[PDB]
């Protein structure tokens with residue numbers, strides 16, 4: 065009956081409301097004031113109101129709203145003490161190791177379940193291997209992705225969040241097939257009316273995330289990298305066609321390639337492959353039936369390389385607008401394409417930060433590169449994504465010697481995580 | 493020293509100014525008051541001012557401007573009498589036969605040169621065969637296209653025209669290789685600083701028109717045909733992607749197919765094939781080097797079918813905007829794509845007209861279908877374009893029994909033209 069929620073962002077608050085209303089756990093949450101003015105605003109705000117709040121936008125999601133109070137908000141990870149049966153990781157996947165290793169020996173020995181909300185590929189292996197020094201039979205659970213979109217509308221009230229969308233389908237894998245925990249999640253899922261698919265293992269669920277395959281080619285190329293680190297003369301956009309954005313036959317080739325390096329790795333683990341196009345079309349944003357042939361979507365994996373690229377290119381062109389939106393009187397639809405790049409930025413202590421795109425993709429990609437080596441698999445497109453990103457960081461360093469920079473710029477991070485995957489893989 | 497110019501549109505007026513300033517011909521022109529309120533406005537306007545005028549927009553085209561007076565404006569074709577050495581066809585290609593057959597026996601016997609300004613594929617054969625009953629050694633000349641863009645700014649002054657663009661390259665073929673006429677055109681071409689390419693025959697020049705390959709798939713499909721004959725709830729556009737316009741993997745397949753049916757026919761006549769993509773890109777509107785690989789443009793004809801379609805699709809997507817135009821401060825370029833469909837319309841005597849797209853493409857396509865049969869070549873995509881167009885006409889007839897309709901709606905036109913090609917082809 066004790067639960068530790070690592071995160072104080074909108075994901076963590078949404079999940080905390082779910083555990084509050086539909087579980088028997090006493091819930092403690094943990095951010096970082098030792099480290100983050102964002103966490104400190106949240107802590108200060110919760111301290112004042114003594115309540116979090118989830119609101120909703122679409123009323124089909126009633127189950128998820130509610131005002132609530134938790135048992136204990138910890139200010140910083142090191143402050144955590146005592147025993148916790150279940151731990152929920154509602155932070156970024158590149159902090160899972162860093163954050164667990166700060167918990168006490170006493171705390172780590174008590175843990176039976178670690179649930180990973182937004183894992184990358186390989187996150188369960190890292191977390192299973194690290195937890196193995198403390199429990200003997202740790203249960204680790206992976207979702208494909210967070211269940212929807214939650215955000216803070218007002219930065220000044222970060223304890224008040226708004227869930228706007230919910231995903232059509234999530235996946236879920238456990239180190240312990242059909243555990244009590246697994247069945248409790250499933251039951252919970254249908255309370256919330258969220259289609260959930262249970263799959264053989266955590267790895268399997270972690271590969272059912274489109275962003276794995278799409279974010280790296282989209283953000284780790286010279287066009288995107290310039291827009292983020294250097295800036296451009298006129299605004300450019302993530303989803304537009306060159307020169308308005310990065311998308312190009314080249315970019316699409318790099319995506320097919322990285323997709324296949326990935327399906328090589330998953331054949332090794334005997335995990336089914338992903339029909340990337342079907343995923344995209346039947347689970348993210350839909351296109352008109354006239355745009356793509358149902359038989360090409362369905363057989364995507366057996367079709368020729370050039371044809372796969374064609375189909376992908378076409379997918380992106382189809383979503384320049386929202387083809388199901390309400391066109392205005394001139395035949396013009398909503399410019400769904402016009403998503404700006406987030407650029408490098410100085411936090412309130414004047415330190416240069418790299419935004420989540422592509423920071424977190426560096427992490428994801430670095431991990432898949434390291435899995436790759438250990439397994440005897442090639443990854444030249446991955447290697448290329450990383451080279452490009454490492455070069456832009458260095459270039460930023462050379463170009464901005466007078467500015468304070470974050471550890472995100474440094475080489476080569478994730479040693480602990482790499483070691484942990486190394487170790488895990490030796491064993492099986 | 494007598495020249496007959498058939499046409500009183502802006503093409504004819506531009507060409508008449510050229511002959512006036514740079515030839516030794518007495519120039520007569522001929523329209524149709526028996527038939528056209530457009531021709532009658534022009535005749536009335538010329539009658540009043542006793543002068544035509546070409547103005548220019550870009551000053552790189554000086555040579556082409558000028559005010560001028562011709563020897564005789566005929567009101568109608570049948571009014572033509574006397575002898576003419578040279579005849580210039582500045583009318584639509586589907587009227588060449590109809591209009592020549594109205595001239596007197598005396599006139600037709602005098603003619604030595606017929607110059608065809610905007611021929612379709614097969615136009616020279618039609619005109620050579622028909623002229624063979626009158627001259628014995630008629631010279632027929634074909635250009636790829638008219639030399640640029642001329643228009644009337646003000647409908648009320650249709651004797652005043654504006655040439656806005658000039659083509660990068662035209663082609664030119666004669667039944668009489670390297671004739672005096674051929675050399676006089678070439679000399680004239682460089683006076684005007686218009687790159688001209690001389691090719692082996694008229695047929696050869698007639699296939700160096702992108703519209704031959706592009707207009708039929710773009711306009712003779714259900715989406716386009718609906719927009720023209722029926723209308724749509726919101727405006728749609730010729731060059732946009734579905735659902736904003738017709739362009740679709742399907743449409744692109746139909747274009748590759750019709751392109752190849754065409755290259756089958758041209759192999760028979762031992763005429764070189766057209767690299768459709770190179771034509772498009774290096775001679776019409778240019779795209780950024782990052783959009784297409786130079787090696788793919790260059791080797792286009794030997795590349796796989798699916799890849800050819802990909803490349804074409806990409807070409808069209810690249811020209812949604814003008815990628816060389818001056819983007820505004822939000823990163824947005826000129827919406828070069830937003831060309832409306834011209835719809836069926838009632839002339840001033842309440843008769844329903846079908847616009848040039850796709851009227852003239854019906855003609856072009858009907859001719860290539862007829863060449864096809866006679867030569868023992870397949871054309872199922874052509875047949876399909878025509879079937880579709882014939883069906884929409886009929887549907888229009890069934891749906892608008894209370895409205896006066898033009899002969900453009902009727903089946904099956906061009907018998908004379910077909911017979912003439914039949915005859916020509918038997919002989920060689």
Ligand SMILES: NC(=O)c1ccc[n+]([C@@H]2O[C@H](COP(=O)([O-])OP(=O)(O)OC[C@H]3O[C@@H](n4cnc5c(N)ncnc54)[C@H](OP(=O)(O)O)[C@@H]3O)[C@@H](O)[C@H]2O)c1
Nearest residue numbers: 071072073074075100102103154155156159182210213214
């Ligand atoms: N709707 C969504 O926002 C959404 C949707 C899909 C997936 N996700 C993913 O789920 C995770 C949490 O989402 P969120 O919206 O709650 O984001 P967030 O507010 O940035 O939450 C991350 C939480 O972990 C902390 N943290 C620890 N180490 C961190 C590091 N290295 N970088 C950044 N934060 C770190 C953050 O502290 P501070 O608050 O002090 O920064 C915060 O409390 C993220 O990976 C996110 O990409 C979110």
Ligand SMILES: NC(=O)c1ccc[n+]([C@@H]2O[C@H](COP(=O)([O-])OP(=O)(O)OC[C@H]3O[C@@H](n4cnc5c(N)ncnc54)[C@H](OP(=O)(O)O)[C@@H]3O)[C@@H](O)[C@H]2O)c1
Nearest residue numbers: 499500501502503528530531582583584587610638641642
């Ligand atoms: N810049 C351009 O406009 C341009 C560019 C490239 C190619 N072209 C082509 O060159 C030809 C002439 O161009 P234009 O701009 O001078 O067009 P236009 O004004 O419509 O000229 C066609 C001339 O021929 C007459 N005509 C005879 N039979 C006709 C028929 N069945 N349908 C339509 N007109 C007929 C027209 O009479 P009325 O004047 O009484 O209609 C007119 O005098 C057209 O085929 C056009 O597509 C034009």
Ligand SMILES: C[C@H](N[C@@H](CCN[C@H](Cc1c[nH]cn1)C(=O)O)C(=O)O)C(=O)O
Nearest residue numbers: 209212275302303349383400401403420
């Ligand atoms: C913003 C960041 N990542 C999103 C992905 C957001 N990507 C979509 C993808 C997309 C493709 N076409 C239009 N939108 C977007 O840019 O809004 C997520 O994990 O759900 C996050 O975790 O909050």
Ligand SMILES: C[C@H](N[C@@H](CCN[C@H](Cc1c[nH]cn1)C(=O)O)C(=O)O)C(=O)O
Nearest residue numbers: 637640703730731777811828829831848
């Ligand atoms: C309008 C008609 N046909 C044109 C073709 C015009 N087609 C272009 C082609 C195009 C492709 N992308 C943008 N424009 C257009 O629609 O303006 C010609 O023969 O030069 C004419 O003869 O005057």
